[PDB]
Write a protein that binds this ligand. Structure first.
Ligand code: ATP
Ligand code: ATP
Ligand code: MG
Ligand code: MG
Lengths: 360, 360, 39
């Protein structure tokens, strides 16, 4: 007569329990190697040998209870066998795992990925990019931030009218203007998580897409990159239905229904990005599926001035105006990425980038 | 009550442990044959039979501990069973393996390859090619070396502003000018390792490509050979999206996102090579994905003079000028490989190659 | 306590060992037929 808690692979606290188990690796006869390396120079690579508990029946001594944990071996199922019938130790373990895991993810953003029909973490948490480090057109980031905050802070108004509680944004523009960087900065600012989804995967179907969109982690963003490349349209639409044009068991109608249909879930934010706004079917970007669409373009006077004052802090304001005037006179259109590269050429050299502005 | 260290196939120190195990093959009842041959002449081939430990339970006598090592048999899992709970002998074994392995790889370069979704070594370490043995245009190798060194030595400046810590270079030119040779020489000079990646493989997908780019060994270079041949573009791009044109489950958008997207890793250097610069999509070679692009071309006066003074050391300087003048007068364009072959015809024969310059 | 040399298929001296084994086929209870014909 005991208690045998069973936690399979498909659990939200699976990572939390794994982290706690790596924390409590002491008193474990079976082990797995946990060495990491950090090269410095001269062939002197630092060693960091440690001990991950191997998938075994290691006996833990938490609170003097001789708790037995077993992880099997690609199907995985962790087991927490105990004595008697108490259920308090399980709650304490879960709470300690939550306290440890959320401590690790502080000031960072967690990136999930689509494995099979489920979301799993993708590497270590990444450092968040400061929002001010990304400079967009005047009064553009503020509008998006305000709209997202208003959507988040008003769930009651949606329910009182029966409107589905969903939203979606689309960003389009020339390559190298700040779409992905702004998305990352916004995710860092809002303390959300990014879920990466690819429409051209070879293991995606309508049912799997619906399941993935239904089971997305809470306090997270769903990102769809280059939705245009997954469906040729427009000129085709005038003759024949929209072909899928790729590898994968997906259809246009399936995606349209999954984004906003009858079985669509609630409290979800979806971001879509493209480079050819004219290659998207009108039914895909109608209101209800894409509430706000914004255009990010080439540099302007204010954008160049702000970029200059950001890359070389402490300089006089006249230098920024001089740089902006010379850049806009020498060339008509320019991308922020090219400006960033040109600045990267002249590291810590103000008044040098103000002279060699020949980049035609 | 013992300690059972388990090291599966997917480990960085797997080769180090294998090398140490081959070093400590004494006192092993089970063996595997380790014969190698070196032909000299007259059908007298030298024999070098030795003893690789077979995948068995050989008992080792390291430090008088009767350590038991078992290698199973395609899935491989090496096991280091010991007595009690000490964990010190594991540290000593790992350190000795590191000392032995890094001793072997001294003055050489290690070439990795993509097996499944993991990097594995490809043959014995290769002898490094001296940098001065590759002669490029005046002030071209120095610029690339300086840029790479500056990128390596300034990680703080990248973090303090938020730019991702990544870089990428592209080399293009006529066939037979020194792309691969210069890449090998640079890898030897920088004491890095080369990872070979083929975009036309039949077992490559977007998720596998992302995983490979995420788990690349540290202090290494990622090489992409003939990126153009894996994606027809340009004239196709004016009508329809970019087709993949090959065998393999890969898409253009997947490669574009993997090279620089949201889930891209940090501290990575990528080299790309092509023969048709005009067959590459503009979005692929935009700044951020390819920071520096350089053109390697046909021979010139200084290049020919340096090559002549390199292949025939000790000759008077006037002979190099005579050879360069005659070569440039007899022909307009000529690849360095043709010059190398013509020199190889006249081995150790200066003033002979300065007369038979008829290679029209 | 013995010595168990293992030579798998992928070895250069595999043919050499096979030829020697065919040479030393005497005192072998188990056999395989080695008949050849010349019309
Ligand atoms: N507005 C901007 N402010 C600062 N840096 C920028 C800006 N736009 C782009 N960059 C920089 O340029 C590089 C590429 O930016 P990013 O990937 O966001 O461009 P993108 O518009 O998403 O391009 P693509 O369409 O190819 O994905 C990064 O180094 C990024 O920091
Ligand atoms: N600049 C050079 N200096 C010395 N040797 C060179 C040079 N360029 C080419 N070679 C020699 O020519 C042969 C081929 O060189 P390599 O493979 O680097 O050319 P490549 O430009 O990469 O050609 P491909 O595009 O076909 O790969 C080698 O023997 C190499 O050493
Ligand atoms: Mg992007
Ligand atoms: Mg080559």
């Amino acid at each position: 007569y005991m208690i045998t808690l069973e936690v399979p692979a498909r659990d939200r606290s699976y990572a939390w329990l794994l982290s706690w188990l790596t924390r409590h690796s002491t008193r474990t006869q079976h082990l797995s190697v946990e060495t990491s390396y950090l090269q410095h120079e001269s062939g002197r690579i630092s060693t960091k040998f440690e001990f991950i508990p191997s998938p075994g029946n290691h006996f833990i001594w938490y609170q003097g209870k001789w708790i037995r944990v077993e992880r099997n071996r690609p199907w995985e199922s962790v087991t927490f066998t105990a004595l008697g019938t108490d259920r308090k130790v399980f709650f304490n373990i879960l709470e300690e795992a939550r306290a440890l895991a959320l401590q690790q993810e502080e000031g960072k953003t967690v990136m999930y990925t689509a494995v099979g029909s489920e979301w799993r973490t993708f590497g270590y948490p990444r450092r968040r990019r400061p929002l001010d480090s990304v400079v967009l057109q005047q009064g553009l980031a503020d509008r998006i931030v305000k709209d997202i905050r208003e959507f988040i802070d008003n769930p009651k108004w949606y329910i009182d009218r029966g409107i589905p509680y969903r939203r979606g944004y689309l960003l389009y523009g020339p390559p190298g203007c700040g779409k992905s960087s702004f998305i990352t900065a916004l995710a860092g600012e809002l303390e959300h998580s990014i879920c990466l989804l690819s429409l051209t995967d070879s293991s995606l179907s309508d049912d799997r897409l619906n399941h993935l969109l239904s089971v997305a982690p809470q306090q997270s963003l769903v990102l769809l990159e280059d939705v245009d490349a997954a469906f040729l349209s427009r000129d085709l639409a005038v003759e024949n239905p929209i072909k899928y044009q790729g590898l994968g068991r997906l259809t246009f109608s399936g995606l349209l229904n999954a984004l906003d249909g009858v079985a669509s879930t609630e409290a979800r934010i979806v971001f879509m990005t493209t480079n050819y706004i004219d290659r998207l079917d009108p039914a895909l970007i109608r209101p209800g599926r894409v509430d706000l669409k914004e255009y990010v373009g080439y540099c302007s006077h204010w954008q160049l001035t702000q970029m200059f004052q950001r890359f070389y802090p402490g300089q006089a304001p006249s230098l920024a105006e001089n740089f902006a005037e010379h850049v806009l006179k020498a060339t008509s259109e320019i991308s922020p990425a090219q400006v960033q590269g040109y600045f990267m050429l002249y590291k810590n050299d103000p008044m040098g980038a103000v002279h060699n502005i020949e980049s035609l």
